[PDB]
Design an enzyme around this catalytic site. Structure first.
Site, PDB file in Angstrom:
ATOM      1  CE  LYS A  33      -1.959   2.244   3.379  1.00  9.74           C
ATOM      2  NZ  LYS A  33      -0.979   1.821   5.031  1.00  9.74           N
ATOM      3  CE  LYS A  82       4.744   0.767  -3.584  1.00  6.43           C
ATOM      4  NZ  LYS A  82       4.462   1.320  -2.524  1.00  6.43           N
ATOM      5  CE  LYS A 131       4.363   9.354  -3.439  1.00  2.00           C
ATOM      6  NZ  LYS A 131       5.291   8.598  -2.181  1.00  2.00           N
ATOM      7  CG  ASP A 144      -2.180   2.362  -3.096  1.00  2.00           C
ATOM      8  OD1 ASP A 144      -1.081   1.845  -2.747  1.00  2.00           O
ATOM      9  OD2 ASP A 144      -2.171   3.690  -2.803  1.00  2.00           O
TER      10      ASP A 144
END
Ligand code: ADP
Ligand code: ADP
Ligand code: ICS
Ligand code: CLF
Ligand code: SF4
Ligand code: SF4
Ligand code: FES
Ligand code: FES
Ligand code: FE
Ligand code: MG
Ligand code: MG
EC number: 1.18.6.1
Lengths: 121, 283, 522, 477, 121, 272
Positions: F9, F14, F40, F128
């Site tokens: 998530k 991460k 991102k 996600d």
């Protein structure tokens, strides 16, 4: 009536003009035009002529009768969901999968898909 | 000029070995032969090409995307002077196991491989079941003469009866007829006579009797035919003898299939099955 | 079958018996060609007055037209500026046709580029084509200036060049000070001569307008000359010679004669001569501006009069005798220089030639087609020779032009027969030369098929073609000739009188039939 | 030979380009390796031209109207749109026809719609329908009309298919709409495909229910020969002498009747693979008519092609084939004995679009000449698969060559002769290099067959050995 | 030209008549007839308008130009196999998947299938 | 060469865990390449010392198309000789957000950036949603080993269950396996045993536990990975233990999904 035949065995989809409602079935139109749907019986019980039919003009879908013989064969092949059975019984609307030897041509545009294999994989 | 031929039988009785050896024998007489492997095992061109296994039509069609782009030259391999093709099959569990046969015969006709530059065309068709794909050559008039490999086994004769039922079913719309019966030695004492009687019941002939020879294994390890491995061997003579009588065959009859009871009584007659009685049932 | 000593090309190789038999088999067996009696009946029907009435009732269909499209003229204008690339914004098929068209007429290299717009440009516009094309052309062929015109495809989809060129400079594709004049040249408006006017006005407006307040009239003491769409190299040379003989300072704007007449010396010069940008910037300092071909230079006249504040004189094309006189007298008044004796002697030699040949020229009927200014000057010269124009055709003429020609025909007894046609093509003219037969045609090489048609009807109905105009494809080096001034009138007079004498010699060559009139002295 | 300096040469020429143009143009230049069978790993073709680099390519309208449909003589071809397109293409390509122009033949005429601003804004289809009626009135002996659409037709939105259907049934005459707008496709190549589809969809299937044509087992149809200078007539006589009778010619001297009679033929003889492979593949699929490529350029390729054609028939044809080879043998042997000594060992660089570059290599080699350079404006990768074996080792290969590139290549190789089009002719003549027009045959020809090889040998000799090429430099220079 | 639109979101397949070759693409035809193909860009760089095209008249297949922009987008959503890329480059034949905002209508019968999701699943 | 993918998530660490993972791996002399599959583009900032590495998607659009793109302009080496690739997504609302992964992974194979004797390849992938180009490593058998980074929170555990469902769907068509459950601490009581309870429910062993401290944030201002900032730190060796446990992991097990109530019971019985 315009019928488009489609199959992986066919290099190109074939477009034919057919007279609606003939005593000769979709099997007649296919055989006259050299479309090689496998026909392996004369009593309509083998189910080898299973085809997938798409009504291209969705507004022009014609009510028909699904006979008890075709219905039972479609169950034995497995190409008849319970919702399509209820739709045919209540609304007289054709199912997605049909037997070409028992399918009467209607006055609309149809896409007919077959794999060259008998019904039941 | 072309004599389209098919060989049927139960799995594991020796269809490929006998077909490859007979086809290799035919090339010796100057005959141009083409082998079409209609078995999902896809090993019916191993002993002609001396290869691990021929690439099947399904393999190249999937690796290239479709059957349209498939070159005939990549599909057709020439070994021993005789053309070789393998239909292959789909993944076990999905589709129809005989789908490769339908795809292969369709592609060969479109690409021109079936044109009459060959004296003989052979189909190595699995006969453990008669369904779409495996019965397609009979249905679509693509193999005029059918030869059934059968042993002195209950299952082997059962498959032979089933294939003859398929032939008569299409006997009125095409020229598909039953050429004869090949007996392969199962090391059974009464089996040569057992198949002679079966052919008489079916209305056909025993085209030959092939004896179980261990020289076949010595050629099989080599990925080679028996006739080329050892031309002076007597096994190559039987295969040669089978080849001449296949060409000289003229008895193409519509068979008369027999029932399950008549098969069983024929088994008990030659001593493979014991004599059954109705009063020894409950014990 | 060929003999190695006498090798035959297509003519007359296919006149051999075996080829004749082969062609007879082909048509009879498979063609299903109409019977020859039917073909002759239809051909004769096309030469009658009832066909002409049907022919002239045409609106939608045009056959064998006598005009090109606008960007062809824009390329010719751009080629007349020093070290300048013609740049056509649109599909690449136009440029290949433009270059081939000019290659066949001038027999010379023609340099032009495209941005090669395609289906993606059809959907999303052609801005990216402009950016990459402008950078690619500048880096590769190194022009000093790039002149941008438009294809009909770019006109329909509404590609605006100003934003595209401006965005190319602000994003670094080309330097901001690199000159990129542009013009919109829709092929569905006007013709090729209109495209010349559009491109010239855009190049002129690109340099002079932002600097207009500083400029004063007459400071540089020269006269601006705007030739227009000109495909005769001698027409450029004669204007320079006449003005330099008078001692008159001049600036020829868009003169391409150098790049179109490069020498063959083992080197390919892609650029040659041309007007410098300097002379374009100094142009509003001139005493006045002279337009050699006013009838297709109308948009340029508005810019020169409105912006440069030059009083552009009302002059006709310097063609013939009277109009070459007016051009020289107007130039003399503007520049204050007298007409020298060399131009007076030259004028008197043209009059000497006119009286020598007037007997053979009197009463000859002429059918002519061409660009408006060229046609009007040709009609005027024919009247001064006593010749009779009969069919005057201008596919790119308007009502105002047609009214001015009629006034010219009204002021002479030799214009009674003459009628002026605007918007008519060469299929209309073919009917005209059949039902009202003239003696000769004057036009470009497309009229060679009309002569072939008239000969098929009969030898006494044949109308020979005289090749003056654009484009001339079946003759060599005729683009080197002159049509303006006294020199151009001498060349035209020599062509006219010797074509009449050539035709008369042919008709009287039959021994014991017509050769009693085969005179040695004419 | 010398592939190392050719590779160096390619690099120096490409240094003028911006990075975007230099990256793409590198994929289109190659050194020939005859051992390669798949050209896709050596050269890239059929791509869009880089903007502003002076490409030689045309448009789809040129490939359809100017190449395929134009030679058909009894049909009337309408240039739908502004006036420019039909005018520049009028009688600019020489296709030889036997007819009465303006009565039953219309090849050299320009029929156009002459679009104005009001037609651009307000429809355009009402003018088309009115135009078709006037064509019927003034040209009653025409046997069909084709509408060749120019760029604005698809950009403003026009339905030329409905006008063709409505007016075609009304007047009982075939109207063929061709969507050959120039912006479609990257070159003339797509014009061939679009034109072939229009033939297939509106003309080819006309005589399907008819069986009143008497067909022999020796029926052949010429395909892809446009009779440039009478080229197809020279080719036809050799086939006729061989016993074969040709029902159709595609499309030089072609008629609407021959096209409709083509599906009643036993063998399709394809000369231009690039322009007519689409229709021959369709005919093999629908009517089962086999087809093959042949070459009638020079004696070596003509004998090879004649024997291959005869191998598709019985032995009477092959005996007849040996007769025509023996009949013409002293003819072309006398041509070689006369002209080869003057032309031996000289190098030629050829740039033509589609079929001619690979096709003319044999005829040059029949005279002792060596082709240093072969290039195509719009060939596909299958055409480049066919030419790598024909070209010598370490020879330059180019695709869609720019004006700058070709000039640089020529001044380094310094060939004795260049064969290209009109747009290149006058550039290399100022440079002192003999030039032969390889599209129009420099208004000479034909070059096909044995009759055309004599003309071809004379033409190359007359230009390469002309006295004018020794006077380019002034004696005081 | 006859176009049949098909989607799981559409209750019935819709049949429309279109003019071939229009500068407005299949995106234009869909928007006049209220077919909800997702269009989320004006530069043709997203994959949102991905559709599956079936040529029903297999004989009447028109050669077209696969634009380099559309080719790269189809590869960015994993919808252009190498065999179909080679077929477009050599034979100028359309691939199975197309971008509706970049697809020019041709004179044939087409079946257009979309899921309502952007290209790239 | 072992191909691995880090799923999880958004916002559980991460990126930083992956950066410090391969920082330790290159300290062992291994050659590791990092591919950022997150829209991102901060997945490689702490191993390159940069504001924001230029994404492949940004470079293609600027320079025409992906064909004109050069491998050198997209592959940058960092500390330890690690090969760094960043693939951004499109702007919000413009097509699939996962097209960047498909373009980049295809681009890397075409240029042959994998065959250069690489040992480890790591994909930092948004977790996600499992769809489009984010599920592409599982769909196309790109990453054989998969590690889920999760914490003791419903969304983090729900994300771990969803990725496992994706593994099952494509298990039969390729060797894509669940390797372990990397667990990071948000400083909550009874978190080590909670995630272990989730791991043994799956039947896949947890790889290692990563507690939270401020040492990673001091490194974040530097833009330099913890391992290279100070090799003697507590967490600096802790990623060494996590890296060592990854290179020497021999057991890969197909996951079995866990229902909503089953996961809810797991979270509740832990007192949360
Ligand atoms: N003539 C023969 N003599 C002895 N063994 C044989 C003979 N023909 C085949 N075999 C053995 O039988 C086995 C199966 O034969 P095969 O041809 O593979 O069966 P199938 O008919 O299924 O192809 C092979 O391993 C081969 O060694
Ligand atoms: N081991 C750790 N100890 C303490 N804080 C951490 C640790 N790992 C990550 N963080 C913090 O959690 C946040 C996670 O963001 P980051 O890992 O950069 O991207 P992602 O959202 O892909 O995980 C970071 O801002 C970081 O400050
Ligand atoms: S049609 Fe083609 S460019 Fe095959 S467009 Fe072009 S009259 Fe060329 S090499 Mo001009 S594919 Fe014909 C041709 Fe060859 S016009 Fe002629 S010479 S053999
Ligand atoms: S690519 Fe081809 S040749 Fe070019 S226009 Fe387009 S169809 Fe035609 Fe004719 S009219 Fe003039 S030359 Fe063009 S700009 Fe408008
Ligand atoms: S028809 Fe026969 S081979 Fe085909 S799927 Fe059914 S049982 Fe299997
Ligand atoms: S598949 Fe996933 S990433 Fe792609 S558009 Fe749908 S939700 Fe977004
Ligand atoms: S053919 Fe047997 S069910 Fe139709
Ligand atoms: S709407 Fe974005 S590519 Fe079509
Ligand atoms: Fe010249
Ligand atoms: Mg076997
Ligand atoms: Mg992150």
């Amino acid at each position: 009536a315009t019928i488009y035949f489609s199959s992986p065995l066919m290099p190109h989809n074939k477009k034919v003009q057919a007279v609606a409602g003939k005593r000769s079935t979709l099997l007649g139109v296919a055989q006259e035009n050299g479309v090689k749907i496998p026909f392996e019986c004369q009593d309509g019980n083998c189910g080898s002529c299973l085809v997938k039919i798409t009504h291209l003009d969705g507004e022009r879908i014609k009510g028909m009768l699904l006979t008890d013989k075709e219905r039972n064969v479609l169950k034995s092949v497995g190409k008849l969901p319970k919702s399509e059975e209820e739709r045919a019984a209540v609304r007289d609307l054709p199912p997605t999968y049909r037997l070409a030897c028992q399918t009467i041509v209607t006055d609309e545009d149809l896409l007919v898909e077959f794999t060259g294999e008998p019904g039941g994989a | 000029a072309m004599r389209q031929c098919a060989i049927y039988g139960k799995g594991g009785i020796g269809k490929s070995t006998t077909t490859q050896n007979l086809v290799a024998a035919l090339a010796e007489m100057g005959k141009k032969v083409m082998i079409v492997g209609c078995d999902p095992k896809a090993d019916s061109t191993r002993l002609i090409l001396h290869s691990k296994a021929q690439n099947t039509i399904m393999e190249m069609a999937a690796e290239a995307g479709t059957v349209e782009d498939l070159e005939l030259e990549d599909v057709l391999k020439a070994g021993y002077g005789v053309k070789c093709v393998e239909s292959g099959g789909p993944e076990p569990g999905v589709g129809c196991a005989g789908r490769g046969v339908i795809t292969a015969i369709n592609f060969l006709e479109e690409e021109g491989a079936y044109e009459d530059d060959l004296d003989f065309v052979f189909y190595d068709v699995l006969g453990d079941v008669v369904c779409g794909g495996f019965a397609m050559p009979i249905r679509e008039n693509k193999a005029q003469e059918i030869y059934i490999v059968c042993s002195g086994e209950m299952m082997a004769m059962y498959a032979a009866n089933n294939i003859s039922k398929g032939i008569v079913k299409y006997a009125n719309s095409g020229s598909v007829r039953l050429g004869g019966l090949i007996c392969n030695s199962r090391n059974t004492d009464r089996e040569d006579e057992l198949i002679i009687a079966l052919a008489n019941k079916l209305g056909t002939q025993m085209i030959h009797f092939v004896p179980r020879d261990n020289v076949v294994q010595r050629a099989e390890i080599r990925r080679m035919t028996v006739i080329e491995y050892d031309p002076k061997a007597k096994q190559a003579d039987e295969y040669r003898a089978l080849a001449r009588k296949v060409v000289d065959n003229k008895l193409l009859v519509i068979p008369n299939p027999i029932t399950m009871d008549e098969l069983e009584e024929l088994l008990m007659e030659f001593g493979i099955m014991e004599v059954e009685d109705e009063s020894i049932v409950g014990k | 079958s060929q003999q190695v000593d006498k090798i035959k090309a297509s003519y007359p190789l296919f006149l051999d018996q075996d080829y004749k038999d082969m062609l007879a088999k082909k048509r009879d067996g498979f063609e299903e060609k109409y019977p020859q009696d039917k073909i002759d009946e239809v051909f004769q029907w096309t030469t009658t007055k009832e066909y002409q009435e049907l022919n002239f009732q045409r609106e939608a269909l045009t056959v064998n037209p006598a005009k090109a499209c606008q960007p062809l003229g824009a390329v010719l204008c751009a080629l007349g500026f020093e070290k300048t690339m013609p740049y056509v914004h649109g599909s690449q098929g136009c440029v290949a046709y433009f270059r081939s068209y000019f290659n066949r007429h001038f027999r010379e290299p023609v340099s032009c580029v495209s941005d090669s717009m395609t289906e993606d440009a059809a959907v999303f516009g052609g801005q990216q084509n402009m950016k990459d094309g402008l950078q690619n052309c500048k880096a590769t062929y190194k022009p000093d200036m790039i002149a941008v015109s438009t294809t009909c495809m770019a006109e329909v989809i509404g590609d605006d060049l100003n934003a595209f060129i401006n965005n190319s400079k602000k994003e670094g594709f080309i330097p901001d000070e690199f000159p990129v004049p542009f013009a919109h040249t829709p092929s569905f408006v006007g013709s090729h001569v209109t495209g010349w006017d559009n491109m010239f006005e855009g190049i002129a407006r690109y340099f002079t307008l932002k600097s207009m307040d500083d400029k004063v009239v007459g400071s540089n003491k020269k006269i601006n000359i705007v030739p227009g769409f000109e495909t005769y190299l001698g027409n450029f040379r004669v204007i320079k010679r006449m003005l330099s003989e008078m001692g008159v300072g001049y600036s020829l704007l868009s003169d391409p004669e150098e790049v179109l007449d490069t020498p063959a010396d083992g080197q390919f010069r892609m650029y040659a001569g041309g007007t410098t940008q300097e002379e374009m910037k100094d142009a509003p300092n001139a005493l006045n501006t002279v337009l050699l071909q006013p009838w297709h230079l109308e948009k340029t006249k508005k810019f020169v009069e409105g912006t440069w504040k030059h009083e552009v004189p009302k002059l006709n094309i310097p063609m013939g005798l009277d109009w070459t006189d007016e051009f020289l007298m107007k130039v003399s008044e503007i520049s204050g220089q007298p007409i020298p004796a060399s131009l007076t002697k030259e004028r008197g030699r043209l009059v000497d030639m006119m009286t020598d040949s007037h007997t053979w020229l009197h009463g000859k009927r002429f059918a002519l087609w061409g660009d408006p200014d060229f046609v009007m000057g040709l009609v005027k010269f024919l009247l001064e020779l006593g010749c009779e124009p009969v069919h005057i055709l201008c596919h790119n003429g308007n009502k105002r032009w047609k009214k001015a020609v009629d006034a010219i025909l009204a002021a002479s007894p030799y214009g009674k027969n003459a009628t002026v046609y605007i918007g008519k093509d060469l299929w209309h003219l073919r009917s005209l030369v059949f039902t009202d037969k003239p003696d000769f045609m004057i036009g470009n090489s497309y009229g060679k098929f009309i002569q072939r048609d008239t000969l098929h009807k009969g030898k006494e109905f044949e109308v020979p073609l005289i090749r003056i105009g654009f484009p001339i494809f079946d003759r060599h080096h005729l683009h080197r000739s002159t049509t303006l001034g006294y020199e151009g009138a001498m060349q035209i007079l020599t062509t006219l009188v010797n074509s009449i004498l050539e035709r008369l010699d042919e008709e009287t060559r039959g021994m014991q039939a017509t050769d009693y009139n085969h005179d040695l002295v004419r | 030979m010398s592939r190392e300096e050719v590779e160096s040469l390619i690099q120096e020429v490409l240094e003028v380009y911006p990075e975007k143009a230099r990256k793409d143009r590198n994929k289109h230049l190659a050194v020939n390796d005859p051992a390669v069978t798949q050209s896709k790993k050596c050269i890239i073709s059929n791509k869009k031209s880089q903007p502003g680099l002076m490409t030689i390519r045309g448009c789809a309208y040129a490939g359809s109207k100017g190449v395929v449909w134009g030679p058909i003589k009894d049909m009337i071809h309408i240039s739908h749109g502004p006036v420019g397109c039909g005018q520049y293409s009028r009688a600019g390509r020489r296709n030889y026809y036997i007819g009465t122009t303006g009565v039953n033949a219309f090849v050299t005429m320009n029929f156009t719609s002459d679009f104005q601003e009001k037609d651009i804004v307000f429809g355009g289809d009402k003018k088309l329908a009115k135009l078709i009626d006037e064509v019927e009135t003034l040209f009653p002996l025409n046997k069909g009309i084709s509408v060749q659409s120019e760029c604005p037709i698809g950009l403003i939105g026009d339905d030329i298919e409905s006008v063709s259907k409505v007016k075609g049934a009304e007047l009982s005459k075939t109207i063929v709409p061709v969507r050959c707008e120039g912006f479609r496709g990257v070159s003339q190549s797509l014009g061939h495909h679009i034109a072939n589809d229009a033939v297939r969809d509106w003309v080819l299937g006309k005589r399907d229910e008819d069986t009143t044509f008497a067909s022999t087992p020796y029926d052949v149809a010429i395909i892809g020969d446009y009779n440039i200078g009478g080229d197809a007539w020279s080719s036809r006589i050799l086939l006729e002498e061989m016993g074969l009778r040709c029902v159709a010619q595609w499309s030089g001297d072609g008629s609407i009747s021959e096209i409709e009679l083509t599906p009643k033929v036993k063998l399709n003889l394809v000369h231009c693979y690039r322009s007519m492979n689409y229709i021959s593949r369709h005919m093999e699929e629908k009517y089962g008519i086999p087809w093959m490529e042949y070459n009638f350029f020079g004696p070596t390729k003509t004998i090879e092609s004649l024997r291959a054609i005869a191998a598709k028939f019985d032995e009477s044809i092959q005996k007849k084939c040996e007769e025509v080879i023996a009949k013409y043998k002293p003819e072309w042997e006398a041509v070689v004995a006369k002209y080869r000594p003057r032309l031996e060992g000289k190098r030629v660089m050829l740039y033509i679009g589609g079929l001619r570059p690979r096709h003319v290599i044999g005829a040059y080699e029949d005279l002792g000449m060596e082709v240093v350079g072969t290039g195509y404006e719009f060939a596909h990768n299958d055409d480049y698969d066919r030419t790598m074996k024909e070209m010598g080792d370490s020879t330059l290969l180019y695709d869609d060559v720019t004006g700058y590139e070709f000039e640089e290549f020529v001044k380094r190789i310094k060939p004795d002769l260049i064969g290209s089009g009109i747009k290149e002719k006058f550039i290399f003549q100022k440079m002192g290099i003999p030039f032969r027009e390889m599209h129009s045959w420099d208004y000479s020809g034909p070059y096909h067959g044995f009759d055309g090889f004599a003309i071809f040998a004379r033409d190359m000799d007359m230009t390469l050995n002309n006295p004018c090429w020794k006077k380019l430099q002034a004696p005081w220079e």
